[PDB]
Nucleic acid binder design. Structure first.
Ligand SMILES: [Mn+2]
Lengths: 161, 612
DNA sequence: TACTAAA
């Protein structure tokens, strides 16, 4: 049922509004949580998200983030390399991710070397933050032990430019 | 009765060497009617008959290419007629040497002519000029047999010379008519563009009066590198680093300055967060220790490009000045031939004998004496190009005999040679990594275990740094201060002479004997002015000239047309295409560029108005 | 008057 599917998403970690979830549903027929998750993953989060990020995250009033949360990535820029030379090897790679939920946008920093997330990651890709995440100075700290990329099929807007 | 065979070499040194090798020490040598070209006579057996051998040497290109007199008047005909309606003949280079008359007088009665010029291109052109000069002088062939012989060799060795004497070939007309076509294209482009440029720009601007604006397939590409560097310097946006550094005290008076593993962060907020996670802390813990042994590789044999580079960077000498000094040294008989490409010492080179000459100099007395006692390391295997052996010292010298200019070049040559034979510098690298909270830091140092070529070239030395303190994993030291360093990215400096030579050699713009001239040409025509550190600064005239070239036709400055047009001309050398079509076609394509240049010259004139 | 490139 619709309530059963909503509950299933609730423990799955996705937080989406009622308009969003009736948007993701193909029809009031037999639709599984798997296809609901896939359809939501395809859709842009800025129109299906809820108010679940605790707000004021850009300030220092929040200590840590808990629970498995799904977030979208807007911009990725290498803070260890200059704008002109985006592939310089003089510094280890270290990425700053602008991470939205559709309502409030936070900023995360790569604390340990990852492999899944790279500069050639399409904007709109989604990640899951299962575990405990540290909010140091209004900045999320991302580790390979609490970040899982779930892919993404959203209309690309960068086009390498 | 005794027939005579005349042989010709491309330089007096090669002439004397080959005569000594063939004659088994029976030289009869005397100067000719030049003072710079000699004649060596001896006797031998040729074509199964006892005959006399007479051998001499030309001094490079006997002849060069030039238009007729009328089309040199610069006013009778516009440069457009130079491409197709302008005949070209051959005049004499260095007319004071009277080389054509020398070859005329030497050869009266030589039944057979044997040739000993270099096997590369630009040697077949010289051999065919020598043939065209000497043929109407000799005593013909009594029978129907042949007389003109070409000898091919790869190195100046007994076995190679004997094999070249055993097997004899013929000159390559198809190879000669490739450098011939290249000379014709160079003339008819660089004399039809420069005339238009200096009759258009000098005819409008008074500040450029009595000045020359020159174009060429090498000069303009050479200027292109400097102009590109100037463009990159002018268009540059500095940014703001944020590097964090730390100090650790071990016992006393030893404060190690650490370096950040994430060497830089381009965000004030992230840098501040990383500081906040570190500054409120007072213990650092060791985690890693490395004592790997490394080595610095000894330099290869000296090449002409490397000699020019080092003379510009360290000795503070211009390329042409360094080349003239090297030529004076070689003529005086101190170093060997200063225009090479090889970097591999030949097998027969008497390294022990040559290194024994510098066994008494006060500068190398300790190093040379030692290196001759425990054995000499074999030279590095570099590259061979069939040219002359690399620049090595040949006779002993002291600051009294030489001046203040040749001695310094000799000092580097005799020091680079010893470093090529000595050992390597083995330095032990020690790295210690601490952990001040979540972040990481490392400190590195170098200690010399056994200096090798360092003692003969002190400028290329492992710097003296204090040894790192002993510490194994599990030791904790007090922490001092941690702070940001608001560094800023700096724009690149101007192009130096050393860097330009590497750029010139990579694209093959100039040869070994032409690199100094091209760099001097753009510096003597006010295109580029030299500065401190031997840096090249494009001038107002240079900036407007190259920039206008890009707007009109980029195929005049790009450092790829010179290499590409040479590849097209290699078709004649390999016999695939005939001489006329390739030269005719490549002249037509350059004729359309000139007509597109003349009708669009107003594009370049707009830029000059701001400048002059 | 020059010019170009090269042994
Ligand atoms: Mn040669």
């Amino acid at each position: 049922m619709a309530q059963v599917a909503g509950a299933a998403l609730s423990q799955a970690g996705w937080y989406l509004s009622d308009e969003g979830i009736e948007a993701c549903t193909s029809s009031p027929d037999k639709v599984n949580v798997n296809d609901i998750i896939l359809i939501a993953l395809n859709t842009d989060l800025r129109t299906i998200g809820k108010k679940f990020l605790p707000s004021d995250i850009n300030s220092g009033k929040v200590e840590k983030l808990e629970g498995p949360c799904v977030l979208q990535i807007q911009k990725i820029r290498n803070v260890a390399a200059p704008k002109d030379n985006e592939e310089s090897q003089a510094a280890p790679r270290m990425l700053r991710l602008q991470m939205t939920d559709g309502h409030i946008s936070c900023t995360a920093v790569e604390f340990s070397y990852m492999s899944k997330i790279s500069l050639n990651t399409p904007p709109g890709t989604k990640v899951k933050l299962s575990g405990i995440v540290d909010i140091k100075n209004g900045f999320l700290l991302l580790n390979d032990s609490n970040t899982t990329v779930l892919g993404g099929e959203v209309e690309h807007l960068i086009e390498k430019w | 009765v005794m027939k005579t065979v005349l042989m010709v070499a491309e330089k007096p040194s090669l002439a004397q060497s080959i005569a000594k090798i063939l004659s088994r020490g029976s030289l009869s040598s005397h100067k000719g009617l030049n003072g710079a070209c000699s004649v060596h006579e001896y006797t031998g057996t040729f074509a199964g008959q006892p005959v006399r051998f007479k051998m001499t040497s030309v001094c490079g290109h006997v002849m060069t290419l030039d238009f007729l007199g009328k089309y040199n008047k610069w006013d009778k005909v516009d440069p457009a007629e130079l491409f197709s309606q302008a005949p070209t003949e051959k005049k004499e280079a260095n007319p004071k040497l009277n080389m054509v008359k020398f070859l005329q007088v030497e050869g009266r009665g030589c039944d057979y002519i044997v040739l000993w010029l270099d096997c590369d291109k630009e040697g077949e052109n010289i051999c065919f000029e020598v043939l065209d000069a000497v043929l109407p002088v000799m005593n013909k062939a009594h029978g129907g047999e042949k007389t003109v012989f070409r000898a091919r060799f790869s190195s100046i060795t007994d076995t190679d010379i004997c094999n070249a004497m055993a097997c004899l070939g013929e000159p390559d007309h198809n190879e000669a008519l490739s450098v011939d076509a290249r000379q014709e294209l160079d003339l008819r482009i660089g004399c039809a563009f420069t005339r238009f440029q200096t009759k258009y720009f000098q005819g409008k601007y008074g500040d450029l009066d009595s000045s020359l604006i020159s174009f060429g397939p090498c000069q303009t590409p050479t200027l292109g590198f400097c102009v590109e560097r100037h463009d990159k310097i002018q268009s540059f946006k500095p940014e703001t680093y944020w590097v964090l550094q730390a100090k650790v005290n071990t016992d006393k008076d030893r404060s190690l300055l650490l370096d950040w593993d994430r060497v830089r962060v381009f965000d004030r907020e992230i840098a501040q967060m990383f500081l906040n996670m570190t500054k409120l802390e007072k213990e650092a813990q060791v985690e890693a220790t490395s004592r790997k042994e490394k080595a610095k590789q000894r330099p290869l044999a000296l090449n002409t490009v490397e000699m020019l580079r080092v003379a510009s960077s360290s000795l503070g000498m211009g390329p042409q000045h360094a080349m003239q000094t090297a030529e004076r040294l070689y003529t005086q008989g101190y170093i060997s031939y200063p225009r090479t490409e090889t970097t591999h010492y030949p097998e027969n080179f008497d390294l022990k004998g040559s290194l024994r000459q510098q066994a008494n100099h006060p500068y190398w007395a300790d190093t040379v004496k030692r290196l001759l006692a425990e054995g000499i390391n074999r030279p590095r295997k570099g590259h061979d190009a069939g040219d002359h052996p690399p620049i090595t010292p040949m006779k002993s010298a002291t600051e009294a005999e030489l001046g203040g200019d040749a001695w310094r070049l000799y000092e580097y040559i005799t020091r680079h040679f010893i470093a090529t034979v000595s050992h390597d510098c083995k330095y032990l690298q020690s790295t210690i990594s601490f952990r001040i909270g979540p972040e990481l830091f490392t400190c590195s140092g170098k200690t010399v275990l056994s200096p090798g070529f360092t003692e003969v070239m002190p400028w290329q030395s492992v710097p003296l740094e204090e040894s790192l303190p002993t510490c194994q994993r599990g030791d904790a030291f007090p922490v001092g201060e941690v702070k940001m360093l608001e560094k800023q990215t700096n724009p690149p400096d101007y192009l130096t002479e050393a860097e330009l030579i590497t750029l010139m050699e990579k694209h093959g713009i100039g040869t070994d004997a032409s690199i100094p001239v091209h760099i001097n040409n753009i510096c003597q025509r006010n295109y580029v002015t030299v500065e401190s550190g031997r840096r090249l600064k494009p001038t107002n005239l240079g900036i407007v000239l190259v920039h206008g070239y890009y707007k009109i036709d980029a195929e005049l400055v790009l450092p790829t047309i010179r290499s590409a047009v040479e590849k097209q001309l290699n078709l004649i050398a390999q016999g695939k295409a005939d001489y006329r079509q390739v030269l005719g076609h490549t002249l037509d394509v350059f004729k359309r560029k000139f007509h597109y240049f003349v009708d669009s010259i107003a594009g370049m004139d707009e830029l000059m108005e701001v400048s002059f």
